[PDB]
Amino acid sequence: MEGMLADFVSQTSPMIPSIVVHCVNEIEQRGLTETGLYRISGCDRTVKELKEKFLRVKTVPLLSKVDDIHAICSLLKDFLRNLKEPLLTFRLNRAFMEAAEITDEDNSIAAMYQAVGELPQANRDTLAFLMIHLQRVAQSPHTKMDVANLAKVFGPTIVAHAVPNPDPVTMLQDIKRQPKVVERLLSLPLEYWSQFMMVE
């Protein structure tokens, strides 16, 4: 199994796994011209092989070699989704959902700010890096992937559940609630996320 986010970072800040950094770098370089980025899945075999090699050797394979940029998108989602706990931790799963469900804009944003501040550093730093990247994806006129669309894709990826294996009632209730969390997070401005890009 993959293990915890912290197992992919060191004391070096911002605390972002090299795999996330390299995936984002590749996607920035040749993915922003692609329609359906993060919606279109890559070849399952290519994604699994890249992931197996990454987890076994503990180093990022040369991503520039792979022709399909969607496989890189799929690898990033797979990595994040399959962490022992989601990027937004088990501990704060419900907190994030409740924050996003507040209809008062000011109070919802304030509750979002509160929940992000309660994240461990590695989680916040990685989240901040991902949010900056996904905002750029949403702002490309070639991707056709707005904040709403990306939230539906990233809901299961970064929010997930409060437990590793929820009962089916909870499971289906949860997936209804995930997109609004991502929607709110992506709606927090670049300047907010950018502040967490800092050295140790």
In Å, the largest CA–CA distance within the chain is: 48
Are the C-beta atoms of residues 159 and 88 closer than 8 Å to each other?
A: yes
Q: From CA 57, how far away is CA 61, in angstroms rounded? A: 9
The gap from C-alpha 72 to its chain's centroid, in whole angstroms, comes to 13
Q: Determination method here?
A: X-ray
Q: From CA 72, how far away is CA 41, in angstroms rounded? A: 9
Q: What is the 3-state secondary structure (H, E, C) of the chain?
A: CCCCHHHHCCCCCCCCCHHHHHHHHHHHHHCCCCCCCCCCCCCHHHHHHHHHHHHHHCCCCCHHHCCCHHHHHHHHHHHHHCCCCCCCCCCCHHHHHHHHHCCCHHHHHHHHHHHHHCCCHHHHHHHHHHHHHHHHHHCCCCCCCCHHHHHHHHHHHHHCCCCCCCCHHHHHHHHHHHHHHHHHHHHCCHHHHHCCCCCC
What length does the chain have? 200
Residue type, 137: V
Q: After which residues, if any, is the chain broken (C to N > 2.5 Å)?
A: none
Q: Which residue has the tokens 């394979």?
A: 61
Resolution (A): 1.9
Considering Cα of 161, then 100, then 96, then 196, what sign does the dihedral take?
Answer: positive
Q: What tokens appear for 76 in the block?
A: 């990033």
Are the C-beta atoms of residues 122 and 12 closer than 8 Å to each other?
A: no
User: If one looks up domain 1-200 in CATH, what number appears?
Assistant: 1.10.555.10
Asked, as a colleague might, if the bond just before 14 is cis with ω within 30 of 0, I would say yes
